[PDB]
Amino acid sequence: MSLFKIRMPETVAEGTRLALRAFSLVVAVDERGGIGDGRSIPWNVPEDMKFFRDVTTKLRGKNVKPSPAKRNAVVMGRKTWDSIPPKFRPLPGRLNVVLSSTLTTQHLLDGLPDHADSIVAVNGGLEQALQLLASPNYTPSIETVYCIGGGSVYAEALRPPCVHLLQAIYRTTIRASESSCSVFFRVPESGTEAAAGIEWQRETISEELTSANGNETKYYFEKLIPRNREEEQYLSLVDRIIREGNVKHDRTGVGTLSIFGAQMRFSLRNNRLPLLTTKRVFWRGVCEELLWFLRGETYAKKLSDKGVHIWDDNGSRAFLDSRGLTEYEEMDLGPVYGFQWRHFGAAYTHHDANYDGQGVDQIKAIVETLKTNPDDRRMLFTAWNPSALPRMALPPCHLLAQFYVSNGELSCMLYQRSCDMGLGVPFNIASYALLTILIAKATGLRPGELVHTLGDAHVYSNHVEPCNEQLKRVPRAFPYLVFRREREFLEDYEEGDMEVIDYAPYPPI
Amino acid sequence: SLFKIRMPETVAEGTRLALRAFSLVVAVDERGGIGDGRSIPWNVPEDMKFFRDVTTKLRGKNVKPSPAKRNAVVMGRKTWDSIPPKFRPLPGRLNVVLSSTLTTQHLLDGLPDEHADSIVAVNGGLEQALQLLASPNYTPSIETVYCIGGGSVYAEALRPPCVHLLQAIYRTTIRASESSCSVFFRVPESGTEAAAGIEWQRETISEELTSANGNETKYYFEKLIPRNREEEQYLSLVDRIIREGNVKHDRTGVGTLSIFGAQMRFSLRNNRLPLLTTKRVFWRGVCEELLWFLRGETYAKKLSDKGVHIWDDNGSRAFLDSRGLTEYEEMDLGPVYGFQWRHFGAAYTHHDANYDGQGVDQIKAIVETLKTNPDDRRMLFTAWNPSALPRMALPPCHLLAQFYVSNGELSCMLYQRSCDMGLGVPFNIASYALLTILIAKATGLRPGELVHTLGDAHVYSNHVEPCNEQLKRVPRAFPYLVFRREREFLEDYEEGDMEVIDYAPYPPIS
Ligand SMILES: NC(=O)c1ccc[n+]([C@@H]2O[C@H](COP(=O)([O-])OP(=O)(O)OC[C@H]3O[C@@H](n4cnc5c(N)ncnc54)[C@H](OP(=O)(O)O)[C@@H]3O)[C@@H](O)[C@H]2O)c1
Ligand SMILES: NC(=O)c1ccc[n+]([C@@H]2O[C@H](COP(=O)([O-])OP(=O)(O)OC[C@H]3O[C@@H](n4cnc5c(N)ncnc54)[C@H](OP(=O)(O)O)[C@@H]3O)[C@@H](O)[C@H]2O)c1
Ligand SMILES: COc1cc(NCc2ccc3[nH+]c(N)nc(N)c3c2C)cc(OC)c1OC
Ligand SMILES: COc1cc(NCc2ccc3[nH+]c(N)nc(N)c3c2C)cc(OC)c1OC
């Protein structure tokens, strides 16, 4: 069963090679927005120093010791490096990236010593640095990148192409003011040319604190984030369902609030992955299940074994019996999803039987069509097989997708009949994002947009309370998907082959 | 007979007698006053002329008004009384008078001595008059209906249920201020409460004119229409495609501007039929094809013999041969659309073969579920069959529909993979409007909403210039579907059974 597989083309890698790495930015400014005199930092505020060290050293997981394996990186201009006393450099617990056209890596090591490799020089600007940090050697070993700046470096961060990779701004405002500030830092206001389409929202602001520096200086911290309209689509819909939805009751008898017919878009460009930030999504499961679908797999134990239990309840003897499927071996789910994708209309017996070259192979057909006739409007697959329906543990929710090509980009539309806004929808968004990414790789195209179409969009009545809390969260920027390695056939791709980078969801509640 | 779907015994709880679409004609002062209770306070002959002309004239070239094809004017009794006996009835128009006292045989009399049968008394308000003018008796003869008023009639015209049938308002403003006016008329402004969710817009306004009554009385005309948000929604999509769409090319190699993924909604409530007004839709064709779909038919000759030729190219000996279908006889389209709806997955041989009981009857199941468990989330039928595809003349374009129930109303969603905005789309909107209306009747629910999902929504390159001219047009209101008779079985509906009322679309784009 090898000639029934999808062969990936020679241009599989350049499809999804990460051009630039996503970064955050950390800065201190006065009320006039000035950042320094061009070689030194004017003010002395120890509480800003503590914040700076903390935001740039600490890692996502709790109590995780920074190490070559997993650490943060700080990127700085040469003059900023010079402003730090040689005794305190390199900054401990972080990878020091220094921008200079006159100083090499080894050259920086001269200066003060006297460890491992905590210093790298880059001949170029911030783009070149983010480019280097995009390579396997730094992705995903380096968890978060911070631009600790220098005027010209901040200047480069705040304009294309870099500004579109800027995920957060951690700004300290010092309430002093003087002539001595020559270099400046200003965040572009919403809807201006300098903003290049981005709309900076305020995530948090601290109360005004006083600095114990002898000068009684006031200061405060702000975290700014780039407005995530895509996730707001989703949040809006949830809010509309609670406010205006109809009370319905699904098969069990559980209450639900329901709206009918809706549509959402998500950009897949430049490695961008629409994993929701207001509530963490179980990505590993998303990844494992799609690959399981793609393979035409119908044995749930293959997911259960890899620690993915989303199909556990639907695969039990108890449930299968209650669907009259009394002859299915436990975890055998019948001709569901993947089977219809790769073997449409094929007669089903048991999971472990051979189904090679049986039924219609819709995925393969689409892959072949995209490569030859990209303008084709029949490029779509479905899992809604009325004949097979009774033989399935469960009817498909996401039952149809159509692909579309424009300017060498692959868009895909998914139609979902029943969409649980709490769990299904976030999961399925990621799922079809991955599919579209993979299919694009398989056809030598770039990812485009994912369009989601919803039928009965519902929120569960007891979920209303949790959901209302989540509505008061401002969506954060989406993470990115990169591939550790490629594989010769499509069906050979494993979860470990790909990595989700810069995923910073909110905590549970 | 046997494998067909039996219609319910009754009309769905809440359904309504068909109401006619009307325009309102009025003369007001700047304070909004229309009269003193029993007469008009001012003398402005130029308004009399405008009133005669707007209510008398028909749509054609020089079509003399006759009992065969004419307009109607609905008025209150007091208004009738105010018109001096020697001018009743108003020539070239059906005169509909509202009165609980006076009958047809009462008003006539009334007049000098010698007689017109262009009069009918109605014992009820404007609603009853609009009901009456929707009768099989009146819908041939009566082309446009005018509300020429009386304060009480205008009031009724401006509130639900009547206000929703108001296609236009022809207001004459007389620039006198008169204290004695005790009866008033205000057109409610967009966004306000009295507007009741209607957005009134000025279509035209005359320059200020002076009357020749020898008082230099200033006056002006304006036409006010309700905004058709839903056709605006379609047009904006068309306009967005032209402005932002990508250049693409169909199978033949013809140019298109296209966009991917869009969604439109249309209301079907009380059998409102979203037939687009800015370019005439071929309704008869839409109707015949749908009933053809519902019956599970696959023989296009059944369609082309009813003078409906949409499937002609796709049915020819030459075309079937090119799709590899050397076995099908001319016009045998294979297991397409209707076949999949009523026999999903059945082996196909020929159009004339018996298919009873074979495959899956998706419609019959959907109908059944709606009747018993309407919160169900599996009430959808697909024509997209990957097994059957290569045996079809054409793969389905509109390929999936989901049903939904809420507040005793049946809504429906349509997925369409390829969307031509000029011809295919407005046609399909009407197809699924009708379907949802029929399925509602079949399951005893009243019609709800049609949601339309578009895949590859496109406009043809050559069709760009004509579209831009259409885009400049202001949308008129949507017509209504009236079933003039009923059937025992859903499959038994002929096109003749249903009448579309008040569909007045624009002439062909020049
Ligand atoms: N307020 C704050 O928290 C904050 C933070 C950081 C820094 N600062 C202040 O900002 C001031 C320094 O600002 P600045 O803009 O003058 O200096 P800078 O950004 O720190 O350094 C600029 C240097 O970086 C290198 N560089 C920049 N772009 C390059 C490119 N495209 N290709 C190759 N090399 C490139 C060049 O070094 P080579 O000449 O060696 O090639 C250039 O001279 C200092 O006063 C510092 O204290 C303030
Ligand atoms: N400026 C203009 O464009 C314009 C146009 C027309 C009229 N007007 C003026 O408006 C004034 C009259 O206004 P109005 O409201 O008092 O009179 P109206 O609307 O013309 O007539 C009211 C009468 O119509 C009948 N009617 C109305 N609703 C009915 C219902 N629901 N069921 C049964 N019968 C119904 C009743 O007659 P019965 O008592 O017999 O039952 C009622 O008394 C006059 O001054 C007239 O000149 C102005
Ligand atoms: C704490 O260690 C030190 C760090 C620095 N770096 C400059 C400096 C200071 C505050 C800062 N604060 C923020 N928010 N962001 C920065 N990018 C930042 C930088 C870049 C300079 C020092 O010498 C004055 C020093 O030793 C005290
Ligand atoms: C049609 O001829 C006549 C009509 C009327 N009816 C009142 C009247 C007057 C102006 C009007 N003007 C407009 N814009 N619309 C009307 N609805 C209207 C009506 C309803 C009264 C008449 O006697 C003075 C008369 O004979 C000249």
One-character DSSP codes across A291-327? HHHHTT--BTHHHHTTT--TTTTTSSHHHHHHTT-TT
CA of B133 to the centre of ligand 1 (A): 83
Cis preceding linkage at A90, omega within 30: yes
**What CATH number was assigned to the domain covering residues A1-229?**
3.40.430.10
A456 with B344: Cβ contact below 8 A: no
Helix (H, G, I), strand (E, B) or coil at A428: helix
**Which of B28, B48, B219 to mutate to test ligand 4, by most ligand atoms within 8 A of the CB atom?**
B48
Backbone φ, ψ for residue A73 (5° rounding)? -125, 140
Least Cα distance to A223 among A54, A407, A1 occurs for A54
> Hey, which residues of A are catalytic here?
397
**Rounded to a whole number, what is the distance in angstroms from the first to the last CA of chain B?**
49
Beta carbons of A169 and A200 less than 8 angstroms apart: yes
Sign for the pseudo-dihedral over CA of A336, A337, A342, A344: positive
Please give the residue of chain B at the shortest CA–CA distance from A359.
B387
CA of A31 to the centre of ligand 1 (A): 21
Beta carbons of A22 and A502 less than 8 angstroms apart: yes
Strand-pairing partners, residue A450, are: A266, A412
Least Cα distance to A23 among A178, A149, A123 occurs for A149
Beta carbons of A278 and A506 less than 8 angstroms apart: yes
Q: CA A218, A221, A223: angle at the middle one, nearest 5?
A: 160
User: Which site among A413, A460, A461 would you substitute to test the B interface, given the most B Cβ atoms closer than 10 Å to its Cβ?
Assistant: A413
Q: Counting atoms of ligand 4 from 1, which one is nearest the CA of B146?
A: 17
State the Cα–Cα distance between residues B366 and B405, nearest whole angstrom.
12
What is the architecture, at CATH level 2, of domain B230-510? Answer: 2-Layer Sandwich (3.30)
| Residue position matching structure tokens 């998500």 | A266
Tokens of A138: 């730094």
State the Cα–Cα distance between residues A291 and A507, nearest whole angstrom.
28
Least Cα distance to A197 among A224, A164, A167 occurs for A164
State the Cα–Cα distance between residues B350 and B479, nearest whole angstrom.
39
For helices A362-372 and A424-443, angle between their N-to-C axes, nearest 10 degrees: 50
CA of A183 to the centre of ligand 1 (A): 10
State the Cα–Cα distance between residues B228 and B200, nearest whole angstrom.
10
Least Cα distance to A162 among A122, A198, A114, A135 occurs for A198
Cis preceding linkage at B112, omega within 30: no
- Three-state SS string across A317-328, please? HHHHHHCCCCCC
Count of CA atoms in the C-beta half-sphere (13 A) of B239: 12
Query: Which chain A residues have a beta carbon less than 8 Å from that of B453?
Result: 261, 263, 415, 453
State the Cα–Cα distance between residues A400 and A386, nearest whole angstrom.
13
Tokens of B309: 């030729």
Query: Which chain A residues have a beta carbon less than 8 Å from that of B249?
Result: 375
Least Cα distance to B23 among B205, B223, B193, B198 occurs for B223
A interface residues, B as partner, C-beta within 8 Å: 246, 248-250, 258, 260-263, 265, 344-345, 359-360, 362, 375, 377-378, 380-382, 384-387, 395, 400, 402, 404, 406-407, 411, 413, 415, 417-418, 449, 451, 453, 455-456
Query: Which chain A residues have a beta carbon less than 8 Å from that of B406?
Result: 246, 258, 260
State the Cα–Cα distance between residues B52 and B49, nearest whole angstrom.
5
State the Cα–Cα distance between residues B254 and B257, nearest whole angstrom.
10
If you count DSSP H runs as helices and E runs as strands, how many of each does chain B have, helices first? 13, 19
State the Cα–Cα distance between residues B20 and B165, nearest whole angstrom.
7
Superfamily of domain A230-509: Thymidylate synthase/dCMP hydroxymethylase domain (3.30.572.10)
DSSP letter assigned to residue B507: P
Q: How many other C-beta atoms lie within 10 A of the C-beta of residue A299?
A: 18
State the Cα–Cα distance between residues A320 and A323, nearest whole angstrom.
5
B44 residue type, one letter: V
Tokens of B77: 């009794």
Q: Counting atoms of ligand 1 from 1, which one is nearest the CA of A35?
A: 1
How far is the CA of B301 from the CAs of B289, B306, B332, in angstroms?
12, 9, 8
Tokens of B266: 């249309």
Give the distance from residue A84's alpha carbon to the nearest chain B alpha carbon, in angstroms. 51
B400 with A402: Cβ contact below 8 A: no
State the Cα–Cα distance between residues B262 and A263, nearest whole angstrom.
8
State the Cα–Cα distance between residues A206 and A199, nearest whole angstrom.
21
CA of B99 to the centre of ligand 2 (A): 9
Rg (CA), chain A: 26
Tokens of A359: 């039924």
Backbone φ, ψ for residue A301 (5° rounding)? -55, -25
Could you give the residue ranges of the DSSP H alpha helices within B61-191?
77-82, 104-107, 126-132, 151-157
* Beta strand segments in B407-445, E: 409-420
Of A265, A386, A417, the CB nearest to B402: A417
How far is the CA of B279 from the CAs of A60, B242, B454, in angstroms?
59, 17, 20
B455 with A402: Cβ contact below 8 A: yes
DSSP letter assigned to residue A346: P
CA of B164 to the centre of ligand 4 (A): 25
Least Cα distance to B494 among B294, B271, B282 occurs for B294
| CA-nearest residue, atom 37 of ligand 2 | B99
A250 with B377: Cβ contact below 8 A: yes
> Hey, which residues of B are catalytic here?
397
Strand-pairing partners, residue B202, are: B224
Resolution, Å (one decimal) = 3.0
Sign for the pseudo-dihedral over CA of B260, B265, B266, B270: positive
Beta carbons of A260 and A457 less than 8 angstroms apart: yes
Count of CA atoms in the C-beta half-sphere (13 A) of A420: 14
State the Cα–Cα distance between residues A146 and A23, nearest whole angstrom.
6
Please give the residue of chain B at the shortest CA–CA distance from A358.
B387
Tokens of B69: 């094809």
B317 residue type, one letter: R
Tokens of A167: 């995920």
After which residues does chain B become discontinuous at a C–N distance over 2.5 Å? 114
**Which of A99, A146, A178 to mutate to test ligand 1, by most ligand atoms within 8 A of the CB atom?**
A99
State the Cα–Cα distance between residues B494 and B486, nearest whole angstrom.
10
Of B345, B407, B413, the CB nearest to A455: B413
Helix (H, G, I), strand (E, B) or coil at B156: helix
DSSP string for A139-186 = TTTEEEEEEEE-HHHHHHHTSTTGGGGEEEEEEEEE----TT--EE--
CA of B217 to the centre of ligand 2 (A): 26
Query: Which chain B residues have a beta carbon less than 8 Å from that of A344?
Result: 386-387
Helix (H, G, I), strand (E, B) or coil at A116: coil
Query: Which chain B residues have a beta carbon less than 8 Å from that of A453?
Result: 261, 263, 415, 453
State the Cα–Cα distance between residues B484 and B137, nearest whole angstrom.
11
Helix (H, G, I), strand (E, B) or coil at A351: coil
The structure's method of determination equals X-ray
Tokens of A294: 């793609």
Q: Counting atoms of ligand 2 from 1, which one is nearest the CA of B77?
A: 24
Q: Where in chain A is the domain with CATH 3.30.572.10?
A: 230-509
Q: What is the dihedral of CA A209, A211, A214, A215, to 10 degrees?
A: -70
State the Cα–Cα distance between residues A370 and B246, nearest whole angstrom.
17
Q: Where in chain B is the domain with CATH 3.40.430.10?
A: 1-229
B interface residues, A as partner, C-beta within 8 Å: 246, 248-250, 258, 260-263, 265, 344-345, 360, 362, 375, 377-378, 380, 382, 384-387, 395, 400, 402, 404, 406-407, 411, 413, 415, 417-418, 449, 451, 453, 455-456
A360 with B387: Cβ contact below 8 A: yes
| CA-nearest residue, atom 2 of ligand 2 | B27
Of B250, B261, B385, the CB nearest to A451: B261
Query: Which chain B residues have a beta carbon less than 8 Å from that of A382?
Result: 382, 384, 386
A261 with B384: Cβ contact below 8 A: no
As annotated, the binding site of A includes 26, 28, 34-40, 48, 78-80, 99-102, 148-156, 172, 251, 398, 416-420, 428, 458-460
